[PDB]
């Protein structure tokens, strides 16, 4: 009920980001939503004296036909002053089950600082540029802004105080408009506890971290090896030597001596089997000296494996993986690569939020124009990570497969 | 008098850390001075400006050409940024046909909108006295000055705020704003249409806004932003192509611009051969000759611009269709229409500048462009007609290492068709000869060697002059392709070559790569395996090409 003064970083003007084109249905949905929000005082129309703009578009969440408004507050976020700090719950990732809740509706009760409102300006675009679009600015705390949870921290603490005092075993973390709740109970007891908590949030997406770990480098186990098999093996081991110190391939290479056909079977010498076994023993151990740095960015790389399968690696320094995984979930995206990639990016970002409490910078195996054209059609998250585009095919694709 | 409705001002500030403009007044002739005096006297009588005292430290230069001209460049440099309403322009194909469309231009446009009083003092200017024997005549604006940064945006927003209630109370008509013009359209009867026009100009008159009392000064076709807007169709204003035996770079830029502008409705416009002469620009004065390709192309452009072509308006009740055709040399052309043989608009897409490429990627990019343009203009994605088989696309996107997608589309059999020219095997080929290839070169003498050895004992090493490591690595693979059967396994340590081939190009800028591709096309089955170099991998003989 009392506005807290918010300013911007020194030497930085407000955000002036181009609003990208929208389809007519999304425009209509946004018009409806913003018309309703104007009647609720949440937003207000502005004049041409407001040169600032933030991109905005419409989405549809899971199991919902009702449209939703999403604002790309990225530029405003990085141009917004740094707020302060709560240490990330390192036990959140260790819990058996974590549920994500949407607490965005709470933000709209708290009024925004007057002087700062002009920086939250956004535009519902017009088709064919007939009009300069409908312009609004936020009066209350906007969903997507990094300042909203920071300001609402005390309030959320006050609301969640009794539940926290009640269940000391239940972990509660918050990121943006999302509230992550971890426990070790049972799915039924979990859902009832969730209904309980949402009821506690009312009067004022099952996710299992335990079923996700880090992935070791595995080598084939065959009775008979062909030349090709050994060539691929030597390649993989040579690659893995960049990560694991003691990897040697000379005795395996010794078998390839001569120019044989790729499909020809070669029996392994004893030295070769020994070398292979040693390499296995080496790969079974974790990676040497791999630490997380909060001051550094998280980098995520994604490779398309085919048949709805995708691999990913989160790291900070090259060959120093902090997390690895393989998304292969099929859910109505059997004929669409972009949808699969978008969902994969979302999942990876979620896991990243659970583990480190911040989003990674993606390196997407897709042309810039394609991604920029279609990614908003399948996005169902209230946050948005950063991304770049890799145009050169990596050779390591089949080394994670 | 009837008190016309007021208009709330728009709060305007100067840029932070800056102050109002203070510029020395230019010397003006006695004639100019007299003219300005009379003009400003009339204006002051009208209420557009007001006389001020010497307290005001701000001043703006003014000239006479009689018509006065206030140079606000410095004040514009010192005036805040505005939400500029002009970014991109409407496209005639996006407009939805109406039985009637009338135009109401606004006279006394900017001088009918009040300026924020706190800002008026910054727009101060002086008129030089005769012989400068008296202090100059001091004035300030009470309304929006023409040439001022904030005038168009504020005028636009005011006009919108005024027009909104009339629009809301008349959903059976559609009103559009553009600068000093209003375009009203409806499907009503002509009498009721003129009636509602009258109601509109009365409504505007209540705010003291004057419209043509006579028969409206402009009737179809409307000449707007280079377009001709007719009742049943739209086109572009007549094309202007100069002909001279000595061309400069600037002339090339203007010609390219005009051809690109014409290509939105005229199909089959090509601009590559003329655009290749824009390399090494920034030198506007030059004499660039023409090739046979460019001259034949320009002749074909004069062949297309020979007879007029018209585009239609948009009808939301019908589907939206875009058809694409390959034109070769990285050129693509497309037509967006709803009914056959009647285009909404047309266009072209040129491939990006890269080392290697294939047809499918370019087609995909073209689809991207058309899609984005479509969403801008009509707010939806059109169904596509593409010159590519469903199976081709399937195989492509399934095996492609990148993620890719095309919206709803169908195959149209209009050659040339986009096809996959070759496909690498996924596993080694049984009964196929195995070519271990390698290449190497001396960095200093630029001398090199490229070759292969196979499982059957087939060998070859070729000496090369003026070449590099990458070139020899490619050359080795090429040699393997040349001297092999219809099915072949190939082993290389070149990450470079493997990258190139895994990028799957069907044409390149490097002749060697093109030759390799032509070899691949002739092949039935090709398996390309990779191994690390210098790992003592038998077969892989780095010691054979390093001599
Ligand atoms: N922003 C903007 C903007 C810029 C220029 C315009 C020109 C005519 C026009 O006209 C229209 C105004 C309102 C609604 C529908 C319109 O046009 C449908 C097409 N059309 C055209 C000309 C004609 O003679 N007959 C027609 O059917 C609307 C315009 C809007």
From Swiss-Prot, chain A:
- What, per the annotation, is the impact of changing residue 283 to S? 31% loss of polymerase activity. No loss of RNase H activity
Outcome recorded upon mutating residue 383 to L: No effect on RT p66/p51 heterodimerization
Q: What is the effect of changing residue 205 to A?
A: Complete loss of RNA-dependent DNA polymerase activity. Complete loss of RNA 5'-end and 3'-end cleavages
Q: What is the effect of changing residue 181 to I?
A: 25% increase of DNA-directed DNA polymerase activity. No loss of RNA-directed DNA polymerase activity
The reported result of mutating residue 239 to T is: Complete loss of polymerase activity. 87% loss of RNase H activity
Q: What is the effect of changing residue 178 to N?
A: Loss of pyrophosphorolysis (reverse of the polymerase reaction). No effect on RNase H activity
Q: Which residues cross the membrane?
A: none
UniProt short sequence motif Tryptophan repeat motif, positions renumbered to this chain: 371-387
**Consequence when changing residue 176 to I:** 54% loss of polymerase activity according to PubMed:9533880; increases polymerase activity according to PubMed:9657675. No loss of RNase H activity
Q: What is this protein called?
A: p51 RT
- This chain's source organism reads Human immunodeficiency virus type 1 group M subtype B (isolate BH10)
Gene from which the chain derives: gag-pol
């Amino acid at each position: 009920i009392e506005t807290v003064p918010v300013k911007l970083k020194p030497g930085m003007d407000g955000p002036k980001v181009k609003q990208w084109p929208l389809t007519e249905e999304k425009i209509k949905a946004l018009v409806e939503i913003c018309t309703e929000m104007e009647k609720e005082g949440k937003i207000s129309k502005i004049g041409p004296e407001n040169p600032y703009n933030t991109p905005v578009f419409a989405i549809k969440k899971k199991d919902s036909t009702k449209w939703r408004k999403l604002v790309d507050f990225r530029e405003l976020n990085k141009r917004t002053q740094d707020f302060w700090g709560i240490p990330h719950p390192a036990g959140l990732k260790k819990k058996k089950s974590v549920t994500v809740l949407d607490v965005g509706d709470a933000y709209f009760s708290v009024p925004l600082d007057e002087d700062f409102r002009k920086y939250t300006a956004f535009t519902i675009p017009s088709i064919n540029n007939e009009t300069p679009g409908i312009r609004y600015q936020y009066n209350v705390l906007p969903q997507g802004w990094k300042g909203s949870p920071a300001i609402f921290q005390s309030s959320m603490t006050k609301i969640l105080e009794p539940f926290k005092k009640q269940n000391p075993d239940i972990v509660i973390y918050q990121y943006m408009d999302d509230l992550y709740v971890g426990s070790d109970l049972e799915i039924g007891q979990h859902r009832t506890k969730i209904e309980e908590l949402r009821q506690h949030l009312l009067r004022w997406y099952e996710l299992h971290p335990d079923k996700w770990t880090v992935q070791p480098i595995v080598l084939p186990e065959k009775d008979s090896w062909t030349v090709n098999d050994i060539q691929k093996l030597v390649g993989k081991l040579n690659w893995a030597s960049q990560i694991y110190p003691g990897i040697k391939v000379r005795q395996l290479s010794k078998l390839l001596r001569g120019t044989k056909a790729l499909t020809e079977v070669i029996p392994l010498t004893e030295e070769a089997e020994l070398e292979l076994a040693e390499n296995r023993e080496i790969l079974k151990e974790p990676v040497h000296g791999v630490y997380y740095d909060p001051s550094k960015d998280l980098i995520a790389e994604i490779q398309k494996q085919g048949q709805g399968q995708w691999t990913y690696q989160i790291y900070q320094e090259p060959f120093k993986n902090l997390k690895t995984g393989k998304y292969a979930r099929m859910r109505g995206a059997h004929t669409n690569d972009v949808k699969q990639l978008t969902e994969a990016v979302q999942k990876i970002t979620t896991e990243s939020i659970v583990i480190w409490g911040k989003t990674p910078k993606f390196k997407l195996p897709i042309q810039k124009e394609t991604w920029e054209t279609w990614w908003t059609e399948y996005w169902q998250a209230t946050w948005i990570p950063e991304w770049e585009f890799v145009n050169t095919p990596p050779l390591v694709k089949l080394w994670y497969q | 008098m009837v008190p016309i409705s007021p208009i709330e001002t728009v709060p305007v500030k100067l840029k932070p850390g800056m102050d109002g403009p203070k510029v020395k007044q230019w010397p003006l002739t006695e004639e100019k001075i007299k003219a300005l005096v009379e003009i400003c006297t009339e204006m002051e009588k009208e209420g557009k400006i007001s006389k001020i005292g010497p307290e005001n430290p701000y001043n703006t230069p003014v000239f006479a050409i009689w018509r006065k001209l206030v140079d606000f460049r410095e004040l514009n440099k010192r005036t805040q940024d505005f939400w500029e309403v002009q970014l991109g322009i409407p496209h005639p194909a996006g407009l939805k046909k109406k039985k009637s469309v009338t135009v109401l231009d606004v006279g006394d446009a900017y001088f009918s909108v009040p300026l924020d009083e706190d800002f008026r003092k910054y727009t101060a200017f002086t008129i030089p006295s005769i012989n400068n024997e008296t202090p100059g005549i001091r004035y300030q604006y009470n309304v929006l000055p023409q040439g001022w940064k904030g005038s168009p945006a504020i005028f636009q927003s005011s006009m919108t705020k005024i027009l909104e209630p009339f629009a809301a109370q008349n959903p059976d008509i559609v009103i559009c704003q553009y600068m000093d013009d209003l375009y009203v359209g409806s499907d009503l009867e002509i009498g009721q249409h003129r009636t509602k026009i009258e109601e509109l100009r009365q409504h505007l008159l209540r705010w003291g806004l004057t419209t043509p009392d006579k028969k409206h000064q402009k009737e179809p076709p409307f000449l707007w932003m280079g377009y001709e807007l007719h009742p049943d169709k739209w086109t572009v204003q007549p094309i202007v192509l100069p002909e001279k035996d000595s061309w400069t770079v600037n002339d090339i830029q203007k010609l390219v611009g005009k051809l690109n502008w014409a290509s939105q409705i005229y199909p089959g416009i090509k601009v590559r051969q003329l655009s290749k002469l824009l390399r090494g620009t920034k030198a506007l004065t030059e004499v660039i000759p023409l090739t046979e390709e460019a001259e034949l192309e320009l002749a074909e452009n004069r062949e297309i611009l020979k007879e007029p072509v018209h585009g239609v308006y948009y009808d939301p009740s019908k589907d939206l269709i875009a058809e694409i055709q390959k034109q070769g040399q990285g050129q693509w052309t497309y037509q967006i229409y709803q009914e056959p043989f009647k285009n909404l608009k047309t266009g072209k897409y040129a491939r990006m500048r890269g080392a290697h490429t294939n047809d499918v990627k370019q087609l995909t990019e073209a689809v991207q462009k058309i899609t984005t343009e479509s969403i801008v203009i009509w707010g939806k994605t059109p169904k596509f007609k593409l010159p590519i088989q469903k199976e081709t696309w399937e195989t492509w996107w399934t095996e492609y290492w990148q993620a890719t997608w095309i919206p709803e589309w169908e195959f149209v059999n209009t050659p040339p068709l986009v096809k996959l020219w070759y496909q690498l095997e996924k596993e080694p080929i049984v009964g196929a000869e195995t070519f271990y290839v390698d290449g190497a070169a001396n960095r200093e003498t630029k001398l090199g060697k490229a070759g292969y050895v196979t499982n059957k004992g087939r060998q070859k090493v070729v000496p090369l002059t003026n070449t590099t490591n990458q070139k020899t690595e490619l050359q080795a693979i090429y040699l393997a392709l040349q001297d092999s059967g219809l099915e072949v396994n190939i082993v290389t340590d070149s990450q470079y070559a493997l990258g190139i081939i895994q990028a799957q190009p069907d044409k390149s800028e490097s002749e060697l790569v093109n030759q390799i591709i032509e070899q691949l096309i002739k092949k039935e089955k090709v398996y390309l395996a990779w191994v690390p170099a210098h790992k003592g991998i038998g077969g892989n003989e780095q010691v054979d090409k390093l001599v």
